[PDB]
Amino acid sequence: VPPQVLPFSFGESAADVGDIASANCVVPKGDLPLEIRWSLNSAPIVNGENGFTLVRLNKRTSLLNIDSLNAFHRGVYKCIATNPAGTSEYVAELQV
Amino acid sequence: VPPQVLPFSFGESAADVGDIASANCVVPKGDLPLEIRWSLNSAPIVNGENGFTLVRLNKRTSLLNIDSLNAFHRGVYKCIATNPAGTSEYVAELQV
After folding, report:
1. Within 10 Å of residue A89's Cβ, how many Cβ atoms?
2. In chain A, how long is the greatest CA-to-CA distance?
3. With b meaning 16 or more CB within 10 Å and e meaning fewer, what string describes A50-86?
4. In sequence order, what are the residues at sequence separation of 6 or more whose Cβ sits closer than 8 angstroms to the Cβ of residue A29?
5. The Ig-like C2-type domain covers which part of the protein (chains A, B)?
6. Into which CATH architecture does domain B1-96 fall?
7. Chain B window 57-96: which residues touch A at a Cβ cutoff of 8 Å?
8. CA-to-CA distance for A43 and B65, rounded, in angstroms?
9. ∠ CA B3-B86-A51, rounded to 5°
């Protein structure tokens, strides 16, 4: 069984500077183990850089958080699931 | 400034038994401190009961998670923000 990433949104398409943003990637179906990664504009997002905060709260969940938005968090956000059976993704967008 | 709860979804309206469900309540605007509570069918959700898992990952964020869905997680999910300036909420729905 390959993975399937449910749709996700920031609850918005734009947000002010200094405000918080949060998105939730959920993979309820797909063979384990699962690789779940976040990227902004086709560049990887790492826990503890550029104001990001990644939290694998579950083997099937990966929350991304931003505590203080700025002009470098604007763009396209993607969450890619991967297992040996295949890959799956979903895309969102955000401006500031 | 009263709170404003951004729209949120489970990424779906139905899910199979034994699967995981996850929803994210975000309150990027509104005076602090903020009270954020989850309920299912107008009944409060508590961290560590009925298969639920609440995680105040932030002062402006409250993720709800379910690790093994069953026939008692079906219904209407609500996330209510509260400060001395007022309240705000958003509603989602889920069946199994």
Report:
1. 15
2. 41
3. eebbbeebbebbbbbbbbebeeebbeebbbbbbbeee
4. A1, A3, A4, B19
5. 3-96
6. Sandwich (2.60)
7. 57-58, 60-61, 63, 65, 67
8. 28
9. 20
